[PDB]
Amino acid sequence: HWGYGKHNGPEHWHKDFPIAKGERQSPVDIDTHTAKYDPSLKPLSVSYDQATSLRILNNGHAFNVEFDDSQDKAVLKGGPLDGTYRLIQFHFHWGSLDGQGSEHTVDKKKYAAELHLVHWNTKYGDFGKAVQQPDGLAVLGIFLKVGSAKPGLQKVVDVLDSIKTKGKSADFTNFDPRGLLPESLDYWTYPGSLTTPPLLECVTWIVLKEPISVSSEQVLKFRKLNFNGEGEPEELMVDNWRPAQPLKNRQIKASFK
Ligand SMILES: Cc1cccc(=S)n1O
Ligand code: NA
Ligand SMILES: [Zn+2]
């Protein structure tokens, strides 16, 4: 099945998921000189005061921090969005080395990692129905650079030892995702897709300009996770990023001058 290695990595995905070569695939390179300021964009509204995390799971590709999405508790609205999008999970993509790991790039620059906060459009009732729609998802993407530690990340780092291998999960209640946000909500936005199979073209991407800083010790702990399951040969979970895809007939808009 699909993964990130020589034989089942991104260059193979199109055989099981032909939309890999579609018209609105993600990630993309953000050319900052080509992205036009759009004064009709709104500030993003990120309302995470009532977010209820439940669990963390190693799915064999990354780890997911999952939320209770059965009530309007943690929502994204405003920005380029019409309506209200509910947080369902977050996860990261990261590298084997600090010079790579992000999926979007900025003027070809790769960051050490990228956080994706995944939200679904409540007009479609559930996440499964939302991913059948071209406006079903909104993903808030946040770059990570290595430097000072991010205090708000440490509870996630410290639980990873308990979910080393594929299929492991741990209770993960009362985690506050506001601690993962940078100061500024300035962003770029474009229409795109999931960056993992099934690569569905449902996503309004909202990519923050300001990275957060994490410490080298924090990212090193991500890199001790495993893609394999318990009692299988160890394959470190690193380099779980898809490279940039063709922009095609799309425009990247900036919320800021
Ligand atoms: C599972 C998922 C949902 C939305 C975006 C991305 S990159 N992923 O992986
Ligand atoms: Na849920
Ligand atoms: Zn992702």
From Swiss-Prot:
Substrate binds at T195, T196. It catalyses: hydrogencarbonate + H(+) = CO2 + H2O; urea = cyanamide + H2O. The keyword Cytoplasm applies. The record marks Y4, N59, N64 as: Fine-tunes the proton-transfer properties of H-64. PROSITE patterns: ALPHA_CA_1 (PS00162), ALPHA_CA_2 (PS51144). Changing N59H: Reduced proton transfer. Optimum pH is 6-8. Zinc. Can also use cobalt(II) with lower efficiency, but not copper(II), nickel(II) and manganese(II). One of its GO terms (biological process) is secretion. Disulfide bonds: none annotated. Activated by X-ray, histamine, L-adrenaline, L- and D-phenylalanine, L- and D-histidine, L-His-OMe and beta-Ala-His (carnosine). Its cofactor is Zn(2+); Co(2+). Zn(2+) binds at H91, H93, H116. Changing H116 to D/N/Q: Reduced activity. Interacts with SLC4A4. Interaction with SLC4A7 regulates SLC4A7 transporter activity. Interacts with SLC26A6 isoform 4 (via C-terminus cytoplasmic domain). This is Carbonic anhydrase 2.
